[PDB]
Amino acid sequence: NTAYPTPLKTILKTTPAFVVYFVFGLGFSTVIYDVVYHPKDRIERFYFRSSKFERLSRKRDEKLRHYFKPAIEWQPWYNTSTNNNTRPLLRY
Amino acid sequence: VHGEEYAQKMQKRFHQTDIWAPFRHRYAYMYNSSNKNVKDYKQVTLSRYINGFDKFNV
């Protein structure tokens, strides 16, 4: 006879519940990661997690693309008459 | 169109010209006085789920 020790056999009853819990938790975490990882080709660090100099370098190009080109190429008749324009960088 | 002297009077702000105080409607405070989202609200709410919104600064 090569049966299991008695203390081990009792606690083994809860193991399938642990397994299904792990399956569900891994699925949840994987879905969160995949949803985050799709639009940004990497896992982007949080903006507040960088230094002051880093914060300027990460947002410079977006500022130039969204607020510099439309301003340096501005013409009086470019704007929409519906008054629903792009919002300022700082809201006043 | 309203006179050459009028334009320079209207474009003049400071008596002393050795201090730079550019005009600002407001002053930024959050994120060490910086901006985290430099995109429209639609891009703010869609770039977290939809690809093609970030230009991948490399």
Say whether A55 and B32 touch across the interface (CB within 8 A): yes
Residue with structure tokens 């949840």?
A28
Say whether B28 and A40 touch across the interface (CB within 8 A): no
Could you give the CA distance from residue A69 to residue A63 in angstroms, rounded to a whole number? 9
Distance, in angstroms, between B15 CA and closest chain A CA?
Answer: 28
Residues in A closer than 8 angstroms to B54, CB to CB, are 39-40
Say whether A48 and B48 touch across the interface (CB within 8 A): no
Could you give the CA distance from residue A89 to residue B7 in angstroms, rounded to a whole number? 29
- Dihedral of CA atoms A34, A38, A42, A44 in degrees, nearest 10, equals -90
CA B4 from centroid of its chain's CA atoms: 29
Distance, in angstroms, between A4 CA and closest chain B CA?
Answer: 50
Under DSSP, is residue A82 helix (H, G, I), strand (E, B) or coil?
coil
Say whether B57 and A61 touch across the interface (CB within 8 A): yes
CB A61 within 8 A of CB B57: yes
